[PDB]
Amino acid sequence: ANLAPAVAPALAPX
């Protein structure tokens, strides 16, 4: 779970 930031860029358009 600590590695969840790896998906954060997907939110860039929002």
What does this structure look like?
Helices cover 0% and strands 0% of the residues. It is rod-shaped and about 25 Å long. With 14 residues, the chain is largely without helices or strands. It contains no helices and no strands. It is classed as antibiotic. The entry lists the keywords 3-10 helix, peptide antibiotic, antibiotic. It forms a monomeric assembly. The entry is titled "trichovirin I-4A in polar environment at 0.9 Angstroem".
What is the element layout, followed by pairings?
Elements lengths: L14
C-alpha termini separation? 22 Å
Task: Tally the helices.
Answer: 0
Q: β content, as a range?
A: under 5%
The residue fraction in helices comes out at under 10%
Count of individual beta strands: 0
Secondary-structure-derived class: little secondary structure
Principal-axis shape equals rod-shaped
| Largest sheet, strands/sense/barrel | none
- The radius of gyration over CA amounts to 8 Å
List the main descriptive attributes of the protein structure presented here.
Trichovirin I-4A; monomeric; rod-shaped; little secondary structure; 3-10 helix; 14 residues; antibiotic
Brief characterization of the structure:
It contains no helices and no strands.
